[PDB]
Design a protein around this ligand. Structure first.
Ligand code: HEM
Length: 189
């Protein structure tokens, strides 16, 4: 994946766990030779997956737990490393934003020309509810989507309940996420 993902992982770990840890994790993963990650440089996917497994071990947290946290972090990280304007243009509400994710990764592709973006399809079951279809060229990153949606909840000041209703490793087409999202009414009543 692009070095931007790998720096984001480095920055997330260096923030919550201090720099000694991150360089322990970097060693377990087998990546000392890489003196640092370049955002715009494509890397073998190995680099990302190996960091996650190294992080899981050194930190004693499951891959799934780290992915869920990363997914939330990425929302923040992207808006602060100079992609705030893409995020902003993609929508002014969760439902709007969800429908333009492919369009967003299309726009990202201009800056990152070897991107292998994910694919999202939105089925609006109401103005409080949606089915999210996630399709990926890769395995094992459905948990990141949990995290992302939690970040997007905060983004739109919306409370988002997410249960994954379909799982690819049970032989389904794509991961499906059933999504319940409510604003001010959660608070006042
Ligand atoms: C400005 C905002 C964003 C940027 C710059 C961005 C960029 C990227 C990049 C560079 C990758 C790595 C893929 C590769 O190198 O081939 C990626 C992966 C991914 N992005 Fe985005 N992204 C953005 C927003 C989002 C948002 C809002 C979501 C919300 C759901 C999302 C979901 C994902 C997922 C799930 C992956 C994992 C790859 C896969 O499924 O195969 N991204 N993105």
């Amino acid at each position: 994946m692009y070095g931007l993902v790998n720096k984001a992982i480095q920055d997330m770990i260096s923030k919550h766990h201090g720099e000694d840890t991150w360089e322990a994790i970097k060693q377990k993963a087998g990546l000392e030779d890489i003196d640092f990650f370049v955002g715009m440089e494509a890397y073998s996917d190995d680099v990302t997956y190996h960091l996650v497994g190294a992080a899981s071990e050194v930190l004693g947290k499951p891959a799934e737990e780290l992915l869920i946290a990363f997914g939330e972090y990425w929302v923040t990280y992207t808006s602060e490393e100079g992609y705030g304007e893409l995020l902003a243009s993609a929508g002014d509400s969760l439902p709007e934003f969800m429908e333009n994710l492919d369009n967003l990764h299309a726009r990202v592709g201009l800056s990152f020309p070897q991107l292998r973006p994910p694919a999202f399809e939105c089925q609006h079951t109401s103005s409080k509810s949606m089915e999210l279809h996630y399709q990926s060229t890769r395995c094992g990153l459905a948990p990141m989507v949990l995290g992302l949606l939690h970040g997007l909840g905060k983004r739109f000041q919306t409370k988002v309940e997410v249960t994954q209703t379909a799982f690819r490793e049970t032989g389904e087409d794509h991961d499906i996420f059933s999504i319940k999202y409510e604003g001010a009414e959660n608070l006042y009543f």
